[PDB]
Amino acid sequence: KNYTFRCLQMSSFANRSWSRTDSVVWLGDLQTHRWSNDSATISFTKPWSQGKLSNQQWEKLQHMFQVYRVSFTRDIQELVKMMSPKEDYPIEIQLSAGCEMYPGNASESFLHVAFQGKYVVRFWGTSWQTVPGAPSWLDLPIKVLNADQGTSATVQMLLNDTCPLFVRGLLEAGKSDLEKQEKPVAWLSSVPRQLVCHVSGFYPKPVWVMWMRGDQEQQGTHRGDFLPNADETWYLQATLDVEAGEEAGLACRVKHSSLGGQDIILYW
């Protein structure tokens, strides 16, 4: 139902001269773009990654980002000079920017900045601001970023207008991929005893995995984290810590949307 579109920028500055910026773009849990430092252009990772943008609008939008990437890079380097010796290299900067799409024509945009792996700055309303817990020295960079009216107007446009527009078109173009159903396949195994139910290849992410003795759910079931497969499906395991000899009669039941109420039921 709700989809979050995230442009994730990761920039490393090792010293005064060396730096690199790499970005990836996600719609929900599907990757839509990749922009490597080695590449002059943003790459589509889906056939539909241009959304409903005409070639002309795409080219214009990419060109703005191309100039941004060069500009950002020099700006950081100059902000370091400005703050020195308070802050030194190496420096990691991350941006998470995009919009979450709600039903109707509702959405919310965000632009969050992390410095050395800590969220410190956001764009909000019409200006950059530091968030709570951020160090005071950032007040100077904020003052300097906020002096740039042209950047402020452009970001306001990107966040308020461009993002929701783009994303709506991406959701229409990517519809069949977004709504894809791929079936989980399950298998069982054991270690010192401890039983594992492996569930792999399912899409989308929501899933139900429980150990059962007949119809009684085993409360000790421990769902692990969702782990990605390389083909944009998901992997998940559920463990049950049991006494040796008491395996017989235990089953792993999997419910997933792709199965149409035909649950996987695997008996040990």
Partner: T-cell receptor, first 111, second 113 residues
């Protein structure tokens, strides 16, 4: 918002030390030194984002910069050469893009 | 050399208008400023243009900026002797102190009284 420079004119010898001084009472964090030569636009030599900070510009070679205080930014030629014959402009600014230029200093370095 | 001015120099008679041109490759181009510099003197700001398509005026000076074409003109209406000077086009690549200024080498105007 005013910027001053001293001296306004200097005749120096090759190998001599020359200091070009720039003063600014606007409480501007940022100061800039340039030279202007015929056939070229102003070119950035050194700049400063605040006291005790100096940064190399595009043509730093043969010049040291000094920012002992918010008010003062010096351009120091330790071993003057005829190639440093030029007009030197200091400028200052705050966080905005405007640079406020001083009136210029004419240097001639004779052999 | 990312900022080019034309003509290099021109001679006009008092009361004539003239047009000076600035073309640049500077990226990004936040703003474009025109300076007047009398011989032996400092830089006097005549105007700054900031918009994609922009027009300004300041007495007998008017200027245009077209950021798509990366082209600005400075017009002087009804020249006077004191317009004898070098006119310098400067493009700032940021809208803040993080910017560098890129100077054209100037156009020399002589106005015959």
């Amino acid at each position: 918002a005013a910027v001053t420079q001293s001296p306004r004119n200097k005749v120096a010898v090759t190998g001599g030390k020359v200091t070009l001084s720039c003063n600014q009472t606007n409480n501007h964090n940022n100061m800039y030194w340039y030279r202007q030569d015929t056939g070229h636009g102003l070119r950035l030599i050194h700049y400063s984002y605040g006291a005790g900070s100096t940064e190399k510009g595009d043509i730093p070679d043969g010049y040291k910069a000094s920012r002992p205080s918010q008010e003062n930014f010096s351009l120091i030629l330790e071993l003057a050469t005829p190639s440093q014959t030029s007009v030197y402009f200091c400028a200052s600014g705050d966080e905005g893009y405007t640079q406020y230029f001083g009136p210029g200093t004419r240097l001639l370095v004779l052999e | 050399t990312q900022v080019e001015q034309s003509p290099q120099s021109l001679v006009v008679r008092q009361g004539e208008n003239c047009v000076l041109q600035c073309n640049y490759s500077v990226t990004p181009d936040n703003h474009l400023r025109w300076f007047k510099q009398d011989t032996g003197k400092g830089l006097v700001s005549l105007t700054v243009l900031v918009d994609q398509k922009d027009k300004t005026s300041n007495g007998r000076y008017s200027a245009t900026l077209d950021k798509d074409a990366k082209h600005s003109t400075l017009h002087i209406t009804a020249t006077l002797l004191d317009d004898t000077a070098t006119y310098i086009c400067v493009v700032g690549d940021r809208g803040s102190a993080l910017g560098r200024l890129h100077f054209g080498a100037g156009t020399q105007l002589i106005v015959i009284p």
